[model samples]
Target: MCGNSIDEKTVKKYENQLNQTVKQEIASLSQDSGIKIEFSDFKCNADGDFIACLSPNFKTLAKDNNDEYQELFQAKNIKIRSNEIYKGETNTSISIKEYYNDLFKNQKSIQSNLVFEDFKLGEKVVSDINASLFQQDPKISSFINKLSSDSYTLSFDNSINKQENNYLDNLDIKFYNAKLNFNTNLNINLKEDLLNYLDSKGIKFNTQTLAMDEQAINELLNSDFSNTIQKYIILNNFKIDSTLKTEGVFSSYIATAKENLQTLKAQSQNEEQALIFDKALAILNNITQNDDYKLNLDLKFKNIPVSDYSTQGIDSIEKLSINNQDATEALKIILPFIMFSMLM
Candidate 1:
């Protein structure tokens, strides 16, 4: 027999062949004042249990929309056993926060969105008239040039600046008591970083939105609340990985087994007829763990005012470790299922 031993050095040579290691999900954190914030999406497994995703609130994975998911960072067990019960919950809460930004400190923004329809379009284009655009000098020069061309002279008695501002002010813009939710049944409280629960478990929490205010927040992520205008709410959506959000682990396990059987149905010129199919079964075995242990997701729903980050006591990294198989072998099995094709 070959003398290679199944030590850490040898085991690492096969972990990569596995696939579907990460699961991700999130709830849009939106609501204010009397309005309520909903986690947004709902999903579950065959038995009708809600399969959870990696929300910024739940696991550390989805910290924001800007974070990326790579396999190396995903949580995993050195040896995945079916009997291993992986259970977790997310407690969430939301509350009102003052809406103020540097943008508001300088140029006065009318209490709402500006309307372009009220402006006279046929009267030649004028730029400097809108102080908000910061084209004061250029606009005046253009206005004078337009006057020389007979685009109509501005009556000194009638001020356009005042007129334009009035048009913009008519729109309604108001902030609300921004309603937020929590998953706990306890009395709801609110704060900025509710990740305290996760942090109590000693998990690292990081959520930064490029240092932009509300407008910057609303634009990148899809939101329609008045506060979201140039301002955005932060969610730990960064840790979300679309691959294994739930039940598909068992579902696809069966489907792919059949697909590989179908491949064997056709004549093959390759000498290794069982090559692909053998690899498929190996992956299937790892997840099911010889069908002895159970693989299930513990999901819960509700809103928690994000007053702090105390729910999580477990570091995501703590749950994952190495298996006898190396990373490449793990990838070989997982990559095939990515597209449901033989190709990764």
Candidate 2:
């Protein structure tokens, strides 16, 4: 056997082989009788993580939906583990500062999201998500983390509702841990944002001149009370993880309007208008009193074939085949990039 020599010259020969092999193999794949692939952000490592802008460069791969697919393909914070390649997250955000910047200066809002795939359910994430007795048990938590499937996705999205005279900043999260999956929705008021929105909407009174004056405040609240107050929901799902769910929408309007109604009731010519004002207040008070009315859920869960979870839209890249000409063109585009990558 030829003994291996430890020298830069010999080392380069093998490096050249790797580059040629990857380029040739990918170039030979296409759609009709071939395939499309990409090998960008090269690293010489043989283990651990391989984070990069995932390729076939969605631009070439998803020929039909290239533009629609770009945002996801270019999403931030992608960390893909080597062996189980599909297990990772595509996370990104748009600043609320941008929202404020646009609205006052022009137009503005903020948004962000984190999505996890095949996440290894661990104690830390579970503990941080503590409260559920299920998470407290080490065995249960481990079992949750231990279970792995292709389609499992955990995600969170939040945005500021930049309505100037009214702002509703809210968060929503969906988690899939083992057999348990849940979604949460929450929002907070933008007091100052509300003040500005009121001005933008042309309030009858100058906001600065009558700041928080009861009548001014009441008038403004009545005009946009729906964007204030809080919405609530607690532990749910009596049937565990059953598929097919639709939840009714709840908003700050119900709570804030109820509170404002009380204020209006006290000031209105109410004693003689019992049949009108009193009855309406009683009904509104009764509805707002029930917490369940503040929160309602429609839950349905579908346990689909695990492998059905795939990233490519419309069709999988694996199903694609390429003709000789297509393969040659793909190689042409990719080969240059590989050479440039090696040089870099």
Candidate 3:
């Protein structure tokens, strides 16, 4: 729904729904990690552009690679807040350089259009930034090189906040009509750079051959026909973009599937949890068919490697599904080649 006349009560309801979803996710995730999460006081501004305020400083713990307990998130107190702005003629889109400049320019919190204010990176964080820069792009180095001080009270022109890498990054983000739009432009060519970097790091990707013949008994001994299949396959540049939504609670979905309380309770807890699961499961016990679910999945393989086999190849596997229907005939095209091969 579009906002302009939304009220506090309705806002709170959605906030609760969002937080409930977060909690459920954390709970399910914690089952394996054995970490418990406790935090509250989530707030939102209805008038503002989808701004959400988190607890001043959220905290959590973790175990390091050595299995030693450590304070996680490197935070004594971490505050998180976000807002979604709409694209407008007033030049709302800016590069990361400008965003960084804005952060340094207004330390005193003046009337500025920047997303962040009173921003200061600690010594450790600054060091971390430098180290990361050393890895990602030694050319860019650290912001500390541009601004001697790790901390600042903003109130400077772009001259003071400007850095050497203005052309390398651009981020234009906006939110409107309950949707977020994000566009990024970077000067670097990622595929070549990333692959080259990985090679420089001595990182190696290897694969094994799982099977070359299909006749389990005859092929193993006779070597009749060379049927090849790799066990593991990892595709690079895999990207997916789709619009996703939920079926309203306890409603009959598009696929003639009826979601009822019985199905939901069967899967989860006694009470309707404040989590997203409750909402999803609300279409519960009798979910006979997949509903208004559509997905677009895209993946390209530079090479495919079986867990124990060799790196191989693949065409762009563009798969999609909508309203309980397959959008791509992937199975029809793929199965025959994989299943039956005639050696000429």
Candidate 4:
């Protein structure tokens, strides 16, 4: 199906036939937390929907603690005869679908199938705890270090205050605030050094504008002078290559360096003064002038798939993204054997 371009008739047929409406809303996660959102008439009939439903997937252990002498007989007898031990289990496979519109609207559909686990003896219900014994703080700010998209992330540090209808549609929390500053860190004071280079070649240079010349143009690409200019800008924040770089936006700085410093060997009678500097100056100068500003950012994740029941009832235990660990399984293994005799 992925290799072939789908037909429009088949596409519309499924879209129209597989229609289902589902909605979800969760609130009062705990008494102190006030946040609730409802997804109404959410149409989750398409592919790529985030679907999840609730079920009881759990384990049980039935072993006699005082079975040091007749342990094998007691357990083996129970294993052979007990049907209730195996029947006392719950496991569910829940399915879900999600939908999103171009403007970022979201919807979901959910279904659940609950079933009993396998038959076994020596069955005991072990309380399942979801979090670590030790508490760890989430330093949300560190997330920005991983940003590479055209847009970086931001964060706002305020809590949500539910007003009138305090229980619904009020996720007032912000991931960021109105930013006070946004610029690069390289404080490249090109006005002085640029002018000095031009003047050394008897080319008039303006502190407010660059005067390009033949020598300046050549130097920008093939001389130590251009290298020095780049080196000076390297004093900014973050690591960068020692060699100057461009990203389709600022490569013109070198060309601007040329025409302003052209020491004339000849002249055309009716040449129009190139306004390259006039056109590109303010932008380059703005970059050069205030390239040291910092920014305030906030963050929020949207359109996340969740079951309607859970969205309305369960706690969002954790916002997890890290890879799963072996610690839990490893600890459980040694714990059983190590505590086996003790429990007895």
Candidate 5:
């Protein structure tokens, strides 16, 4: 059984302590890296058999020449929560310290989850570079400006479940204005696989005892255990789904490249180079002629073996579909550049 209630004062005290410790660590890291780190709305709450903490806003910044801090990256609504199952002692002190001690001593199973609501990369990082180095180059400045005008956001969620020997982990990530999602899952018998792998490697050691000399440690590290370990593990699902809208950065860059290629073709000294440039221009013309372009891809794998664990062919991949008109057109533009580079 586990304690269900913690006094409000004690929870507040521990929350302040945790916040102070985190702030000090962040300060030290900022001093070492010469970048400013800031966060606000930090809180830790203890409820039932779980503790959860969240920061509503966290960001990092770099100082510019004007002594102004410019945002490099920002994340919003980051949270971490964990729940532990206690097997012994009911009605004990429901304090954070007790929870910490119990976490290592009496924890039989744990469930943890982490989430990030919004993660963004700032445009100033590239604009700063352009201001310093490429100020005189119109072509380079145009490309950099296009890059700086683009925007994208990322969100992430992860969860882990562990009970005795069984373990499961899952991760999901989403990015871009067009909504790209990548997800992965792993389910395995953690302890059984470790013991089996150690036994197969001819390393003998007591499960509850940890005593190893230098030679034993070297042997353990040197052995290749990844393939052996994978035999006991399974990837339930791995998937990627994305639908990219190409009207923003993609269109801007494509237009810029087309303009540059036309200029190069007009000034070409040799027929071979001019022909190559003409081919690239033709493809870019088609892509730019259309508005509101979209690219999509969907890939999935189910019950796939993560290692080389079989001789007979077993097909585990379920589906793969792609609408890659933009991708093919992009490649057409790149191929001519490769041919033009060879001629030069």
Candidate 6:
């Protein structure tokens, strides 16, 4: 009796009621905010004490003075589930609505897991984004255009525990058969080395005044960082496993990276850039020297909520480290620049 399915008439009535409420809510919100809201294809079914719903094609459009609407945001599909719907005794829409209202009102916290499969940006949205990027740097924007064609999966889990304490458990983004995982308690400090690297390139700025002048900005835009980024994309096949308050263990593609670096080093013409490639090759060499050795990136922070300003300022914070001795030595050579480039 507990798992019995609700009648077809009851299911249709419930669905209609839910859809009507959603439509009225959207209309009221659109009028109040002067924005157009569209939601459709809300379908659900009820069985015993459970319900499952799919709400697809939700979009918001901004209205101009001419009354023309421009899309501001859009989502393809979303799913909702509830296990306390209890359709055996109370089958009316009012009773079901009241049950859900009370259920939500009494809940202390909510946890959510969202997964986007074959995630891709819309062509129109990508174009608009690239157009904005073009104003900053055409080369970078062109690179983004190339990258936008690739499909990937993005998933994240989060929860709200209290009014002030919202927690994001993990966020995983997968592409090229690899994943980049992020969680809380991971920290990196590279302000000093980053500033020194910029100063060496004649692009100087202070901590308080982080913005570069127009000439410095132009000089940076013309640098070879973009080319470096393109070459670095080859490492996408590398597998990286990261955990909170620990290290990120890197595997796969170690030998491949060594071979590629050697080739690039041999072909390099610029002394400065060639030296970077040489340093990277040295690090890869250290890793490949011992078959048992693994590449580990230190993700743990030495201090948290750091105190004692005189001794514990930003510069005093420890930099990222590697575990192996030989690898650690070569890592210091190019790690800061690589990290800084990625940050920029």
Candidate closest to the true structure, highest lDDT: 5
Tens-digit lDDT string for candidate 1 (1-344):
33222333212212221111222211222222221221212121111111112111111222223453211111111112111111211212211111122223322431211111111222212322233334345544454444323311111011011122121112111111112111111112122232232233333211121111233343455523333221211212111111122222235436676676557735544534454445445445554553232222121212321322234311111121112222333343344466366443
Query: How would you order the candidates by TM-score, starting with the best?
Result: 5, 6, 3, 2, 1, 4
Compared with the true structure, what per-residue lDDT tens digits does model 3 show for residues 92-191?
Answer: 3333323333434533221212221222444444555566545343323432333322222222111111223211212222111111122221111122
lDDT of 2 at 162: 47
Could you estimate the TM-score for every candidate? 0.18, 0.25, 0.26, 0.15, 0.47, 0.36
Q: Between candidates 1 and 3, name the one with more favorable lDDT.
A: 3
Q: What's model 5's lDDT at 167? A: 49
lDDT by residue for model 4 over 190-264, one digit each (tens)? 223333444455443221111122345755554344544432221111111111112232334335654543422
Report lDDT (CA) for all predictions: 0.25, 0.37, 0.35, 0.24, 0.55, 0.46
Off by over 4 Å in 1: 1-273, 290-323, 326-344
lDDT tens digits by residue: candidate 6, 66-148: 76666655556655444433343342223222333343454443344444444455565677777756635444555466555
For model 6, what is the C-alpha lDDT against the true structure? 0.46
Name the lDDT value of residue 287 in candidate 3. Answer: 33
Q: Which ten residues in a row have the lowest lDDT in candidate 5?
A: 205-214
Return the TM-score for candidate 6, rounded to 2 decimals.
0.36
Best by TM-score: 5
Model 2, position 3: C-alpha lDDT score: 26
Clashing pairs in 5: none
- For 1-344, candidate 5 gives per-residue lDDT tens digits of 55655555545555575577678888887885658987875687776656667888778887776877888977777776656433333433233323434555544455666665566666786666677666464755775555454445555555555555544556666665533333433333333354444545444322112111123565556745577677666555544544433334356667678889989988988776676666566545543455444333444445545564354122344444334222333334454577589769
